[PDB]
Design a protein around this ligand. Sequence first.
Ligand SMILES: N[C@@H](CCO)C(=O)O
Ligand SMILES: [Ca+2]
Ligand code: NA
Length: 404
Amino acid sequence: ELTSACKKSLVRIFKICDIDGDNLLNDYELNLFQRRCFNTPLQPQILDEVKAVIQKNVPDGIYNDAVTLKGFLFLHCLFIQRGRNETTWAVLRRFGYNDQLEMCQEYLRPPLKIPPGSSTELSHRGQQFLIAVFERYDRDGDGALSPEEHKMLFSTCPAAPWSYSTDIRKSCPINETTGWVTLHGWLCRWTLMTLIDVVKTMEYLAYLGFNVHENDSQLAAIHVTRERRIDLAKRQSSRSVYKCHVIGPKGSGKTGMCRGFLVEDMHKLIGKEFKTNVVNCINSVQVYGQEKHLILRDIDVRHALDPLQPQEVNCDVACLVYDSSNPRSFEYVARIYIKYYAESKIPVMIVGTKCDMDERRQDYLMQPSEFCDKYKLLPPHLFSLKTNKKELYTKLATMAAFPH
Ligand SMILES: N[C@@H](CCO)C(=O)O
Ligand SMILES: [Ca+2]
Ligand code: NA
């Protein structure tokens, strides 16, 4: 008696309303979402009348004095055959469904005007919701999400916003022993998406049930920040998420640098080729007492005469990487800086990798130390994976967070 499309909707709503992740709708959430859909408290007499009917007609419908999914589906299947579809339709409407039982576009994509220069970040409520969601689908409570848990989480979505195996497990911090996405990495992946694709973030937040939980549009999950002068306003809006473009020639070792941002032990990335092309890596660092998220975009390696796109040049901080063991490697960095960054307002940091081996001379006309000295740049940062030092990442974020 229940439509296959209607059942799909009622299932998602059950998962959203299951705030304990125990496959049950206890008294609390039943009353809470009652005001979400009907703006009235659920009077105790009705709830008893509801449970009694479910218990009477449906086995395994009431477990531990709580409504199960099998009983929840029956109740609305009973509502439609008793001439009260408006009760069911009031619930479907609140969780973002229209007359065609499809997610409303105005419910998924609310209008958000982003001024030039402004960035998109997660708000306090947006973070809290994502934290709440995380700990619900962390059934075993190991403080991390398994690929089985990560699938259930986005079962209320058409698909996952990212691959578990080829994205979040390689672009975000994970648990060292289990190899699963921690709470920290969870917030990192959402922070990355929110900055580069806010519309997708809000679209997925609606699917996860942010609108119903927060009793507001997903605009409350997005916090728009921008770099402003010495404004004496009481409402601070300083940035906390910066993006760094990592540009270098082939074999520069800049890829291994990006991945090292995510692991405490970099002694396992020394002699390793990367089979997966991770575009954006992200982690947080402490900058003067404040938490700052840094995104290390691995710009696609090309020839030295090949042009760089404006959207590849324009960033918060440019990290030009060359190989110290390759005499013909620094010439790319010198070529790139002069053409694209020499006359820009973007802070640039030159990094020499693989300094563990003997730093051979560069077959260029100027040496890296002299080149930086000529264009008033900081001395070339010697980076190595055998050292496990992470001052570079903290430095990069600081250059993006501060003048010039
Ligand atoms: N659908 C529930 C309220 C919202 O979860 C009920 O009417 O029993
Ligand atoms: Ca888990
Ligand atoms: Na629950």
